[PDB]
Amino acid sequence: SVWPPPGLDFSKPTIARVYDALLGGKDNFEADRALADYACKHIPGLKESAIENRKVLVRGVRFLAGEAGISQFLDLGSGLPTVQNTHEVAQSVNPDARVVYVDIDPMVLTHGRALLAKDPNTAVFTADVRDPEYILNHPDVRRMIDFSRPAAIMLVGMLHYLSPDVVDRVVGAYRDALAPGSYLFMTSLVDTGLPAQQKLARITRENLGEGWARTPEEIERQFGDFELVEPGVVYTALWRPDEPVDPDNLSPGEQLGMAGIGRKKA
Template identity: 55%
Template sequence: MRIAHGRVTMMGSESVPVGIDPTKPSISRVYDALLGGKDFYDSDQRVVDHLIETMPQVDVLAKINRAILGRGVRYLAGEAGLKQYLDLGAGLPTMENTHQVAQSFHPDARVVYVDNDPIVLAHGRALLEQDKSTRVVTADLRQPDKVLGHPDVQKLIDFSEPVAVLLVGMLHHLHDDENPEAVVDGYLDAVPPGSHVFITHFLNEGPEAGPVEKSFLEFLGTGRFRTREEILRLFRGLELVEPGLVYLPEWRPDRIVRDKLTLAERLMVGGIARK
């Protein structure tokens, strides 16, 4: 896959695993395309092409979101000392995955990836077949009871010990009537004090967000941009760790952050909070 002249183009032949409809775009595959992956189909490419027409730097936005995943997990594993991770809406495996970062701090760290796209399971199993501390589960994060009750989750995660709940770039794909606040509560009610939640989300702040949100909703069917106040409600009852809810490049950066952020750098915010 390459990005050239503002277009994302799939290279090579397409193979379709059983249970996947390549005519319908997938959040995980669109994200994979934006990150420079290769596991996507024409329907996903069309979505990316439309997004790029609205915002040429949308692939940069995806990479910024991916970068904060690594920084966030380094905090959770290092400073917070967490050894259990529930990565919800994990997407396709790529560079610096959650289990790789967490296990670089704690070789015995346990990670369960959850996604509703069967292609994630197909690729994840192949990648992780030798890693007994990591599992990939096909489930819908909007159903916390089913996710938490899944045999692989029950086998790997000890809910008497702190858990990191990751919802990185996911809750904006839930519509208001799907009640993202209740989804977050469903997971946090199941984990003990000392657990953390890690959320990144599209931000509705300024006129530039409107056309991008419209493009996501029209061509992907999801992508709700919420206000800072709405996103803060997802953390209600929890203690936000420093620096709080901020633009993604400003969350514990590993490089100098420019005073004037680009549009791509201002379209998402993120934070980690402790129960």
């Protein structure tokens, strides 16, 4: 078998591969599809929640690279590739945009290295986001991002994998690295008291190692002093929609996660 690489199959699911399976990608093994299937059986709207997270990723990156004028992105916990990735969105509005992707799953590097050796403004590497010091000093980071100028750091679909004991220091390190005029874009599994939210967090914790549903206020808090851009921290489908959407008529899948983008002030 030539793909996914058999040497990466330990009959254990990974976060990247399961999310890929939820989106209908082929970068996954049976253990990943089995867990996605199981999760969908217990968690209504799970796949739709992933779709909405990808759609807000696109809308947010388009806001950042176009309107906000940002040319430098650090995409933490990037995941495996989809039909619309960060650098593709960024370059569609801003041909000079530069994106550095970071993921812990080696399959992300293996797939991507292929796709991105032809792009001098896009780089990918394997690392653990819980070690900001290592990521912020990596040669791909240092050669691609000048942190003395505005940048965007993204923890899209990533915040709920940071435990209570590490989250404050980890997200704080990345906020602290940024120049005034920079942005932090995150999305997260949310606890608004709907039953599936904490059940989904449990399944993720038990099967994938980490999974923390945060209240809207706990999500907002991880933006620190940054100034939230309108509409603030809201269900992912409600974040600057480009397609009609009614906040009182959301499905269960549209209430699993929230999105927010905040700006660092001078």
